[PDB]
Amino acid sequence: NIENIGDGAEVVKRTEDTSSDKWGVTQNIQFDFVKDKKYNKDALILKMQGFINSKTTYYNYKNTDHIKAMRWPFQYNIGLKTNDPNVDLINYLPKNKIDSVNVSQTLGYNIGGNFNSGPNGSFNYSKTISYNQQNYISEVEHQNSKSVQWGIKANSFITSLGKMSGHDPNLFVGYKPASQNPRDYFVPDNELPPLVHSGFNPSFIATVSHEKGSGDTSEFEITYGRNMDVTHATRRTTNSYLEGSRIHNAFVNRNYTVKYEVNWKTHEIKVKGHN
């Protein structure tokens, strides 16, 4: 749990695993403390992994028998925040808007406080992210020196019907209903991306600096969750056909938030709370 990355430099590693069956979330956090004699600041690389269940559900609408609903994650939320004035968020990955099916990036470190969030010469330490986001797009929703938040949202779909936007109210609505079971007014699982039928496996990185001797502890709040949309499929007769309608941002910030405290001196980590 201690890796030597060079003369006067080492990485002290800690991990925290925290799950919520209520939110359907697992936070697998890697806390890599960068101890370097040539770097005048405390530094910590946080690798945010785990799982966010999609919580996709299908149900009959009110007292009807012609209207069926699909409650699905329009977006996944991944957020990190500190309330410490002595901490600075110095880099994070992914930085830019990315629609690639797979997101794989590397953070590099070179002795003397040199971080290369660009991916010449080798690194003293590296950390890699890797996640799949088929039909979704990743982009930073918010950033400042104390926080970063990504949105991984429904983007572009090709179902059995054609090329659709993640905002299109007809998205996931079936052409013909299979039965009166509410699932059956919506496209089968092989027409659904994994982020809709199963969930998201996040892989995000953030690096923070801390002014040495300004305080031994800092709190970090990490949030993992979803913004749920509701798609209604209405059976009509022209023999039966389905017409789609959407309640966009039906349930926002359905998130599991965990508060962590790091000790810069002892490299120890506690969980202070969660919802």
Longest dimension (CA), the chain: 77
The experimental method, as deposited, was: X-ray
Resolution of the coordinates, Å: 2.2
Q: CATH class for domain 1-275? A: mainly beta
Q: Are 229 and 173 in contact (CB under 8 A)?
A: no
The CA dihedral of 234, 235, 237, 243, to the nearest 10 degrees, is 40
Instruction: Decide: helix, strand or coil at residue 238.
Output: coil
Neighbours of 260 (CB within 10 A): 23
b/e map of 55-93 (b: 16 or more CB within 10 Å)? bbebeebeeeebbbbbbbbbbbbbbbbbebebbbbbbbb
Domain edges within the chain: 1-275
